[PDB]
Amino acid sequence: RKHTWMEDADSCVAHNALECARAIYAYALQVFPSKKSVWLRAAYFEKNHRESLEALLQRAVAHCPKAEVLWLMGAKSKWLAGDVPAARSILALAFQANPNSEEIWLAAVKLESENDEYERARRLLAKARSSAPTARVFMKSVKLEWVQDNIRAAQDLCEEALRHYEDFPKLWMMKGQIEEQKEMMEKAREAYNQGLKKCPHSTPLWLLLSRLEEKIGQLTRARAILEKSRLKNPKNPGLWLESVRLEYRAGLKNIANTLMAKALQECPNSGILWSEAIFLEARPQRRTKSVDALKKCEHDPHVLLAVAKLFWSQRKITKAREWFHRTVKIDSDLGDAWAFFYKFELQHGTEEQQEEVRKRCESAEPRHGELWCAVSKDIANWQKKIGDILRLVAGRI
Amino acid sequence: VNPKAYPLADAHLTKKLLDLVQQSCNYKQLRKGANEATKTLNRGISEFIVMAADAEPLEIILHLPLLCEDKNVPYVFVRSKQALGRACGVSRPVIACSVTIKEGSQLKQQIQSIQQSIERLLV
Amino acid sequence: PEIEWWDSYIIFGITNLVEHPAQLNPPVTLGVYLTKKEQKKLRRQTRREAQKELQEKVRLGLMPPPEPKDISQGVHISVYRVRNLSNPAKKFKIEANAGQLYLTGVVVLHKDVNVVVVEGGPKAQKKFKRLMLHRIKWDTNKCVLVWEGTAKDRSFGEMKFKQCPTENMAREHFKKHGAEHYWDLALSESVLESTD
Amino acid sequence: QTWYHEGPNSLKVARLWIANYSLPRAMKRLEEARLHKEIPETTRTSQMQELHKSLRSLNNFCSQIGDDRPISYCHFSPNSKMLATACWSGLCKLWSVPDCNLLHTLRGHNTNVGAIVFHPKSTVSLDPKDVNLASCAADGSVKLWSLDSDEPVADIEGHTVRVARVMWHPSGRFLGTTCYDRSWRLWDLEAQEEILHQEGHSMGVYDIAFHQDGSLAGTGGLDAFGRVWDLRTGRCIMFLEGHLKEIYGINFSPNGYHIATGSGDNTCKVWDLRQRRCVYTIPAHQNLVTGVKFEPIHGNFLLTGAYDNTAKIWTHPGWSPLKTLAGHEGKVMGLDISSDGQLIATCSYDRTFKLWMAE
């Protein structure tokens, strides 16, 4: 009966209005105490439809104990709306009720690193490493030590995380990114090779190894590393897309077309490979390539972003805006599609379309994108907002 | 035969290729003609591309292995189009009979076997 | 060794004698496609000819009509490695597969190393590979194909489920039929899979 | 029914010169084998374990693309100078190994190039302006080429069939060429003409290579019979049989007994010469084994390629899969190890050529 009341409240929230749905959610919350799923659903309904969301977060913190997700949502709602030190005090109060340093300590370290006084963030990261050490906490400590400066302590923490979490490729990728920011580049390539040979299946570590072997000259070794990464998975779509991009970056256009054809024959249900085949095709041949990508990979965000880019390149702003709206309705969490939509709104359209694109990028955070991950993984734009990252992704297109 | 036509199949290999081409054309999976084979190679849906060594001139099918080098497809050159002289009802011998993948083909694996057999002749 | 055979034969045996030794051979009726218009013409002509022949045969006055109403020249030999093919259903199916598909061969079992060698025609070996790779569901116990080549003739007589607790007995049983190198390569591949 | 035919006096003089150059070479090889047999088993086992550890950690690197045509063969220059590759186009480039830099691409062919194998003393004791490499095309042509001229030389018109492979003699004065006219030609570098045409097979020979001392020369083609003909007066008594497919790869071991033959029956035959039998049949791969390369003068391994995307670096002898040099994207056609043994190139059908280096 409580599940049916929650489904009726969700259907009332999505169908007509939000007052009766919030009343049904409050009746289901006051009738009987439920688990963290109903509290998270009530918090999402309060955030999607300031004071009411904070009251629901306080009610979930007071009536539903051992709820780290609801406490993190309340701390994020306090830091977004109310105050940053009030959210820090709320996170410190929630850390006194939940002694686990898995997600509360990382959220406290992120809240202390987004604000000033990074020594408190380093002390919280050291306390989280001394209380419950993990690969994610060590990676967050290495990121907090490397976002300020490329000191030897950050390299020592990355080496300790690579020695203690060698099966995890994230510590080796962080060590390679820390060594790549220094003067030398052979140490970063050696760390990326150790992470690729110790995982043994590491797609972003092999991608960073191929990028370091291609950007530092002698791209034949980069092509050999890309072939070894494609044969070690085997037949990874990301490694095939990276090899196609490395072949298209040079003067070998026929080899890049053959690599794109081999990636389409070995993995036809890939949005990134379909977008690369649509971008690498000719201008009168893009209408058949986009149709084949829509027929093979339907309802894909990367294929819709490639169709939006092809419509914007063909001087069709009304079709590119509709394709960007369809890509935002299919997957609003995409970074490259949101960047292409913001670039199309800034290039063709008034400020209302750019404001709507900024509101869509601020409501749902873009992640796992092509241009978003290039700016979200750097140390210079690690503690930045979502709107500035979206503007930097749209301006770099 | 023509020296530029490569690779050249044997008698039983050409008989199996003609049987596979007849099974594909009777099940609506094969396209005859040079322009249709070029369109099937450019579309990326052609499983195999067969040529004819007895073509005057033989340079007109010379882009048929090269497109096979652009889409990673096996290429083969029947000694004479006469092998497919009737082909799929074609009165004249057929040369470019792009055999395209057929969904749930009653001989899909057999066609794959022909491909595997056409990749070892070019050495 | 003191010297080679050619060095002992030549050392004086150099001369201008060009010969062609060992002239031996290495170890047809075919149809073509038809035409659709020719197919329709043939169907019409055949129906007309059948009707005319029936009329001639039953109307001349002889019978009243009714009222009008290859292991040779190359054999495919495959060898697969399984971690635990001891399963009676799996072991018997592989042995029976070889038996029914005429895949003369052997199924040797050892300590976490099961070598199933089949030998026969190309379609029989393809059906056995499709049965052992997609139809026979083993599961840590997995079955993979170690090698697949072509030979002159079949080595084993029939599919016999051999058994050997040690690898030396299985190697001697494979060398009795002349297939010890395939079992050694399968054992080396199993050791490389267990080490890595 | 081995019918004999008389030859010219220049062929007999070249055979006598080859015998007089191979007999002290065979004596030095026998002395080296007696010195290696006098070594204890502990140091030999330690050297074999070190060679196996160096070959097992062989990573593929410097995969430099030659051209848009797939690579058909590759031959390492002597003294680890470069690597001459022969693709499916008319160009035969020479990439500087291990730098993977193409320089002085010897062109001049029209059809698909076959095996462009350099001389064993080209970068050692031959001038770079003279003939140093020998290339062959899909038509009848055995063209000499220099290393710093990028222009061919006056070829031998004695072959009118598809010359599959060509390999120079270790003495340097001769060069064998396997043609499709059911024979194998033996051109001379000093006489500048074809010395003999050994028809030891009923079908056209594919791979022809001489021995380490230059006394014998192994053949093989579509006749499924490997012929080991002596350079003195022919009379191939060491006939290799057992392979039911076409022999597309011949590689003579530095030892006087072992001889590696690669056929399309997914196996490699390491046969003995002192017993005239097949010592081992190693299943190196499952595809058609076309490329095969023997060891350097240490004599410990054998790199056998195939039509798959891998190449097996097995031990010699032993026939064990010690190393699987994978990483290619096409049929591995043509492979050759350097004179030092630390580098080995394996040309593939993916229009790229890498090198296996010890990590």
Numbering used by the authors:
A (entry chain N): 539 to 587, 590 to 937
B (entry chain M): 6 to 128
C (entry chain J): 385 to 395, 412 to 427, 434 to 475, 536 to 605, 627 to 683
D (entry chain 4B): 164 to 522
Give the original sentences from the paper that presented this experimental model.
Notably, in the presence of AMPPNP, U1 snRNP, presumably from the adjacent protomer, was now stably docked to the PRP28 helicase domain of the pre-B protomer, as evidenced by the improved resolution in this region of the pre-BAMPPNP complexes compared with pre-B complexes. This enabled the localization of U1 snRNP components and further supports the idea that the poorly resolved density element of the CE pre-B complex indeed contains U1. In contrast to pre-B complexes, in which the RecA domains of PRP28 are in an inactive, open conformation, in pre-BAMPPNP they exhibit a closed conformation.
The molecular triggers and roles of B-specific proteins in these rearrangements are also identified.
